[PDB]
Write a protein that binds this ligand. Structure first.
Ligand SMILES: Cc1cc2nc3c(=O)[nH]c(=O)nc-3n(C[C@H](O)[C@H](O)[C@H](O)COP(=O)(O)O)c2cc1C
Ligand SMILES: Cc1cc2nc3c(=O)[nH]c(=O)nc-3n(C[C@H](O)[C@H](O)[C@H](O)COP(=O)(O)O)c2cc1C
Ligand SMILES: Cc1cc2nc3c(=O)[nH]c(=O)nc-3n(C[C@H](O)[C@H](O)[C@H](O)COP(=O)(O)O)c2cc1C
Ligand SMILES: Cc1cc2nc3c(=O)[nH]c(=O)nc-3n(C[C@H](O)[C@H](O)[C@H](O)COP(=O)(O)O)c2cc1C
Lengths: 179, 179, 194, 194
């Protein structure tokens, strides 16, 4: 089974989490794991002015999402929604939606946040979009049951472990369903 | 695989939908399907005063939910939440939550509503509870992509067909995962 | 203006929070504050055996919600929703809904959790019902620090942690935010209604 | 009181709704209403090739949101969220957030869909962000029928159906609800701010 870890990160927190998720998924025999990012939308000028951490993972196209059996989406908490960069990217998946290309595939979500709250709303409002595509949504249950998070007022050891678990669990389901 | 269609109905709309969901699930070879209701919480006096349709399906206990591979939950839209009767029942699943008894099992939701809106919020706020139990959430994608609905300002032919589809689709996933 | 603090509590955490909300609201001259609880639905024997806490607040009826200018709802987090007791009570407000009785009145929400997870969803899914009634929804955001009566203090409503074992009580930091929520909502109620 | 109708529109449906919201708001004496759009993020060539509609409304900056007493946000439904363009714009309001610039101001939301699905989620997930800013959230509920300027007319905010092909335009019934939303919010803004 093919697993995509698809993420947006500005300051590196989701980037760090995405590596942990990918590690977990890679523990599963038969899981082929790939990590990609959505494009930065800010001109580099503005990204640099804001102190961004330049991302170097391969950039995904909206259309290639169809190639995977499971997609694990990472986004920072942005006032209780996904980031504009992730939203912009998902707004470019209309062609896939019309063709049913993501229908029935596994989806799961992880996030990063400060200490102000909103991470639960970020995850569940991301689920909404996944459901429009007919994706099967995988929470982690029993920190939120909705998906792995990291809270920064670098991620903690325990936070990285939960992220690894999420990858391992989702990848295991993907192999169960697709070999 | 064992599929439970678990519902609350006051005036029969969810009851009718639950039969359709069960029909769909029963199309899947290897799916063993059961329909049960959550208890009415209103004293019969008050239920009758309100013009309720007495339900006669077997009553589920909170604890027996653990016996199934997939649970498809039906609730009317009650100001954009599940009904108090379904909420009360789910508030009695703390023992299952502590034991991880529903973890990883399939869940899906259908609803009934008037013409005032709220059915999307009812379904997605029901998903929240399912996620606390670690259940895998199955939307229907492409009326809402979140789950089958019926809108009454008896369910329509098309509404019953979508309900049948939801049962068939979820039951198929349950057999794929559990034989 | 009349302000109702309407709550459900099993083990007393929301009860303590509700008293703090009412204390804050009472600071506003011209705000008449009342605290009431929704009925317990569990049989007394089962409630007692579960370690439930008996409470002195009067029990509200659904009908009387119409009598207030602002209602501040408290509920524990129950798998990311309000409790069955609060949901059952709100399901009895159909008559108020049909007559527009709560339309335009202020609403705000506070909660409690064992270990944190689901509090955001409890508050926002309670807002949904308030919106069906046409109520104006008051989040707390992150208020100016000097407005809290405890120094060094979610944006959706005040919360408190009960612990996995339920034995933790609300801290003065948590209660300060609850008091602010009451004072803030009551101030708005007086601004709008005298 | 100053009221901003701030919107994003691709194909003009939200634009038409925004004009209706502004018309309603303008009915309130003492409400100064302005309509602005968030920037298009698509390159002009791609936007034009996609059949996008050019629009006369001035483009808002994030900073100027601080200048208003009420902000009514319009966005199409994009898989049950606000659009990427609105999300990108709101992600630029961190400075306002840090200074408390929008705290306590009124907010309300309207939307549009192709075939209905997701509109509720678009509105309520927009409310989340408004709550982080401490804004007071105004749902429309089901208002008294005589307050709509079209007879025989979700509770979360006004909506319109664009059709699967995008060719449907807002009906007078839909626009009447949008006009009501503007008038209602503007009335509240004047009540609170003069
Ligand atoms: C516009 C904006 C909004 C934010 N909103 C929230 C919020 O709702 N809650 C919170 O606690 N942190 C919030 N944050 C902080 C980010 O979630 C946090 O810094 C996260 O670690 C960043 O992840 P990244 O390093 O992968 O970009 C926000 C940051 C930005 C830039
Ligand atoms: C307290 C209450 C609240 C309701 N809230 C809504 C609502 O939010 N939206 C709506 O359109 N219908 C609403 N309804 C109507 C029910 O959703 C509708 O009648 C549904 O068909 C009933 O399903 P049942 O026959 O299975 O009980 C509500 C009904 C009750 C009793
Ligand atoms: C059925 C049930 C479900 C619960 N779900 C949650 C949960 O989602 N998250 C949480 O951290 N605690 C959860 N709790 C714990 C309660 O939120 C908690 O102990 C409560 O906040 C106490 O408030 P009270 O003393 O006012 O009843 C749950 C408790 C029960 C009985
Ligand atoms: C990427 C994308 C996703 C969309 N998602 C939805 C959807 O969730 N539900 C819906 O009924 N229509 C959806 N639509 C259609 C738009 O909501 C619709 O055509 C829009 O409301 C038009 O408003 P505008 O003319 O102001 O851009 C989507 C459109 C796009 C481009």
């Amino acid at each position: 089974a093919k697993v995509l870890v698809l993420y947006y990160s500005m300051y590196g927190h989701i980037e760090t989490m995405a590596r942990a998720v990918a590690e977990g998924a890679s523990k599963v025999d038969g899981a082929e794991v790939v990590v990609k990012r959505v494009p930065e939308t800010m001109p580099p000028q503005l990204f640099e002015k804001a102190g961004g951490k330049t991302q170097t993972a391969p950039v995904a196209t909206p259309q290639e999402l169809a190639d995977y059996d499971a997609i694990i989406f990472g986004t920072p908490t942005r006032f209780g929604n996904m980031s504009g960069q992730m939203r912009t990217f998902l707004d470019q998946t209309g062609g896939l939606w019309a063709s049913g290309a993501l229908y029935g595939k596994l989806a799961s979500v992880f996030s990063s946040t400060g200490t102000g709250g909103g991470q639960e709303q970020t995850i569940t409002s991301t689920w909404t979009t996944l459901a429009h595509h007919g994706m099967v949504i995988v929470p982690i249950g029993y920190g939120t049951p909705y998906g792995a998070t990291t809270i920064a007022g670098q991620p903690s050891q325990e936070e990285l472990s939960i992220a690894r678990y999420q990858g391992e669990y989702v990848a295991g389901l993907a192999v169960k369903l697709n070999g």
